[PDB]
Structures are given as structure tokens and as C-alpha cells.
Amino acid sequence: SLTADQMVSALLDAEPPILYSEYDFSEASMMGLLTNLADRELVHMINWAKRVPGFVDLTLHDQVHLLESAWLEILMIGLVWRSMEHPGKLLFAPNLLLDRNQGKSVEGMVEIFDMLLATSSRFRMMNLQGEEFVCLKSIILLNSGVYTFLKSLEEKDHIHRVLDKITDTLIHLMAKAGLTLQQQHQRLAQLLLILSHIRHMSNKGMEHLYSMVVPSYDLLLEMLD
Amino acid sequence: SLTADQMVSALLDAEPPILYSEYPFSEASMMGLLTNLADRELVHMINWAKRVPGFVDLTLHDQVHLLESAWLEILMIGLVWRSMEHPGKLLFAPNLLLDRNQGKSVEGMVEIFDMLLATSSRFRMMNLQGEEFVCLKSIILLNSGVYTFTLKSLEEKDHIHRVLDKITDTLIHLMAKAGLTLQQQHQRLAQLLLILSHIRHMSNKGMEHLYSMNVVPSYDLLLEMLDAH
Ligand SMILES: CCCCCN1CC[C@H](COc2ccc([C@@H]3c4ccc(O)cc4CC4(CC4)N3C(=O)c3ccccc3)cc2)C1
Ligand SMILES: CCCCCN1CC[C@H](COc2ccc([C@@H]3c4ccc(O)cc4CC4(CC4)N3C(=O)c3ccccc3)cc2)C1
């Protein structure tokens, strides 16, 4: 029943914190820091998801499936967002800013590195707004697992109703921002097509990680508390 | 410079034909049949792509890269469209209609089989229209490789995004013309484009499956087909 304005406010307040790498330097250390960072972010992801309107109306089983499907995409879009104002680099954490030459030493890394950089550049060129980003991240959560699940059918119906609410919210944001109706449709489409690239990166990133992985159902369930 | 009407018309006109498998059936021959089908389908795909407005304005190198990135997605969405009206089955060809249990025979097949059936069900639930379908397939062609490509390349990406914007305009027009409200127009546009994420997912899993068993068309192969005299 939330208005578009209340949807934005709820998503903005739900934003997780920016974490730091374990601090105080080689390729082995680099991979360890990155894995440790992702593991710590995942906990905060779970708390964020529970505050996306409509998420906790789903069964716990379905909440876990959605997180299983979406967690890597969400880590990636968060990385891409905070790397926007840092051309040519990925800001994994405020104390872990890396460029593509630090990715070359690991096989398969630089390919995913450059895809992430290109997404951040696309974000930059589109002047992605924070209100838009949190809508996009919520769409990934709800959309990524919806096609791979009677009760499931209500659950899927519910997920699609929430997704429609986030679409309404994105259009509302673009309207307040002064875009014409044409520019609203075009920008909406542009933002959602980037999500297919984020899915691709998550698939390639998963392949890369299984070449050197996934949070278990039980772990995700436990974090959901 | 096309209108939405001209865009729809050109896309419908460009549609490839529905091809057949060879004329009892055996699971042992299945992958040979499907590989040959896809091979013959790829030829028509090349000539389809050349007729998608704005595609041949790109360099041959970029045309190849787009097709390299999108060919399996395009085969899959064609499959899903052909199967839409056959619940529980995948209509690879009119004479090659398979169900889930026939996918069991090969390792890792049924997982992808089920994802394709779920996409078919989603198409069916949305009552996807043929005019919407051809727009979606053209978006796949132009979008899937554009983030993995220099002044020429900047010019190419701007062109690709302008053509994608035109297709977006065309999708909205179709929905407006069919009487949907603006709220319903935006909502359906989003619903359609989010399916493309699942199609990308399916393509990556299928690409893994194909390597698990000459797996992709090569650059030079795609370029020979694309680079006509
Ligand atoms: C112990 C119980 C369950 C254990 C599960 N975890 C234990 C292994 C499981 C690690 O998955 C991970 C491991 C590492 C990354 C980093 C990471 C970290 C933070 C970020 O915000 C974003 C990213 C982005 C990225 C792409 C994905 N990544 C990389 O390095 C990278 C970047 C560029 C090019 C190639 C690679 C993410 C996910 C999760
Ligand atoms: C000389 C270099 C070779 C260049 C051409 N290659 C020739 C071998 C290289 C084979 O790719 C192929 C081979 C086979 C398929 C079928 C096929 C055929 C037609 C269709 O419309 C759609 C599909 C869909 C699907 C998923 C992909 N497929 C499968 O079986 C399948 C279906 C369900 C679950 C698991 C698997 C497509 C593509 C491509």
C-alpha cells in the first residue's frame, strides 16, 4: 500500500553500510581480502533484504531462494555503484581501491574486472541517481530467482506485484526529475537492460570463483533469523 | 528515422522461417539432430540480424561481437516462442517436440530444459504478442554484447543505444495501441525486459552445458557469414 515516495524512503533507509577490508600486499592476500569482504557484506545484505517492502511477506524458503539467486549480483551492483566516481578503478572498500592491472595476475579476473568497470562507466554516463540505484538493487533481489523456484504461484504473483510497485516508483522518480514521458520509458528500459549485464557478470563471476563458493541454504536461513 | 510502425514492420518482415529437423526417434541421435538444427538456424539468424534496423550501420567487427554474445540467447528465445503454446514441451522443430523426460537422457540437460519451460510459461502468462517478441529479440541482439566492446567504439555504442531507445519507443507504442494505460505500459515494459535477464542466465548455463559435452561459431565463421560480398 506504500506510495512511491514511501517506497523510496524505505529503500533509502534500508541501505547497508560500506564495509572495509581487513586492513593494515600480494595476489594471495588480494583474493583472501575479497572473499572475506564479500562474506561480511552478505550478513548486511540479509538485513537489507528484510527491509525491502514485500520481501518478508514471502515464505522463509522463498526468501532464501531469492537470496541464493541474487546475492552475487547484489554485491556486484553495490561495487559498481560505489566505483562510479572512480574511473578505471573498483572501490571494493574505502581502503581497497583496485585497478585492472591488479586483476591481471589472477587468471580470469581481468575479464570480469573490465565488465565491472564498463558497468560503472555506464552508470556514470547515465548519471545514475541514488534513488534509482536502490530500486534497481531491489529489482535484482525479487527478479533473479522468480523464474527458477499453488503456494509458489501466489508467491510469484506477490513478487510480481512488488516488482510492479518498484517500476511505478522508478517512473515516479524520473517524473519528479523532469523527464518527459518518452525519456522516462527510455531511461527505465536502459536501466533494466543493464541488469541483464549484471546477471551475465554474476554468471561469469560464479564460473571464475568455481575455477579457484555459494552461501548455503542453512547459512542464509540462519542469517534471516 | 523509422517510426514505431516502420520498426515493427521491418522486424516482422525480417523474421526467420521455422526450420525442421531431418525426416523411430532415439535419444542417442538427439544431440546430433539439435546441433544440425541450430547450425541451419544460425545461417538465417545472420541474415535476420542484417535486417534489424541499425545493425548493418555497425562495423563488421562489432556485428560479429554482438552475434558472438547473443546467438545462443536468440536461439533460446526463438525456442521459447515456438514452445509457448505447448505447455510442458519444447518445440525445437514442428517435427521435434520434446518433453522433460527426454531431456533426462543427457547430463545437465534437464536443468536447462526446465528453465526454458519456465520462460515459455512466463510468456504464456503474459500473453506475449508476436510484435513484442520481435522487439525483444532485437533488443537481445543489440544489448547483449554492447557492454563488452576508442572513438569508433564510442560512436558505435551511442548508435546502439539510440536504436535500443527506438525499440523501447516501439514497445511502448504497441502497448499504447493495444489500449493499455501508461501505468500498465511501464509495468509491462519492465516485465518484458526483466525476462531478458533470465534469458541471459539461461544462455550462460547452456553455454556451460555445450562446453561440458567446435562449440561456438567462431569469429571467422560468423564474419564469413556476416561479411558478404
Ligand atoms: C563460509 C560460508 C559460505 C562462504 C561463501 N562465501 C565464501 C566464498 C564466497 C566468495 O564469493 C565472492 C568472492 C569474492 C567477491 C569479490 C567481491 C567482494 C565484495 C564486493 O562488494 C564485490 C565483489 C565483486 C567480485 C566479482 C565478484 N569479487 C572479486 O573479487 C572479483 C572482482 C573482479 C573480477 C574478478 C573477481 C565476491 C563474492 C562467499
Ligand atoms: C563449427 C562451429 C559450430 C557452430 C555451430 N555450432 C554447432 C555446434 C554448436 C551447437 O550449439 C547448439 C547446440 C544445441 C542447441 C539446442 C537448440 C537447437 C536449436 C534451437 O532453436 C534451440 C536450441 C536450445 C538448446 C539450449 C541450446 N539446445 C539444446 O540442445 C539443449 C536444450 C535444452 C537443454 C539443454 C540443451 C543449440 C545450440 C553451435
UniProtKB/Swiss-Prot annotation, chain B:
A lipid is attached at C135 (S-palmitoyl cysteine). It comes from Homo sapiens (Human). Composed of three domains: a modulating N-terminal domain, a DNA-binding domain and a C-terminal ligand-binding domain. The modulating domain, also known as A/B or AF-1 domain has a ligand-independent transactivation function. The C-terminus contains a ligand-dependent transactivation domain, also known as E/F or AF-2 domain which overlaps with the ligand binding domain. AF-1 and AF-2 activate transcription independently and synergistically and act in a promoter- and cell-specific manner. AF-1 seems to provide the major transactivation function in differentiated cells. The chain holds residues 309 to 547 of 595 of the full protein. Widely expressed. Not expressed in the pituitary gland. This is Estrogen receptor. Binds DNA as a homodimer. Can form a heterodimer with ESR2. Interacts with FOXC2, MAP1S, SLC30A9, UBE1C and NCOA3 coactivator. Interacts with PELP1, the interaction is enhanced by 17-beta-estradiol, the interaction increases ESR1 transcriptional activity. Interacts with EP300; the interaction is estrogen-dependent and enhanced by CITED1. Interacts with CITED1; the interaction is estrogen-dependent. Interacts with NCOA5 and NCOA6 coactivators. Interacts with NCOA7; the interaction is a ligand-inducible. Interacts with PHB2, and UBE1C. Interacts with AKAP13. Interacts with CUEDC2. It is linked to Estrogen resistance: A disorder characterized by partial or complete resistance to estrogens, in the presence of elevated estrogen serum levels. Clinical features include absence of the pubertal growth spurt, delayed bone maturation, unfused epiphyses, reduced bone mineral density, osteoporosis, continued growth into adulthood and very tall adult stature. Glucose intolerance, hyperinsulinemia and lipid abnormalities may also be present. The gene is ESR1. Phosphorylated by cyclin A/CDK2 and CK1. Phosphorylation probably enhances transcriptional activity. Self-association induces phosphorylation. Phosphorylated by LMTK3 in vitro. Glycosylated; contains N-acetylglucosamine, probably O-linked. Transmembrane segments: none annotated.
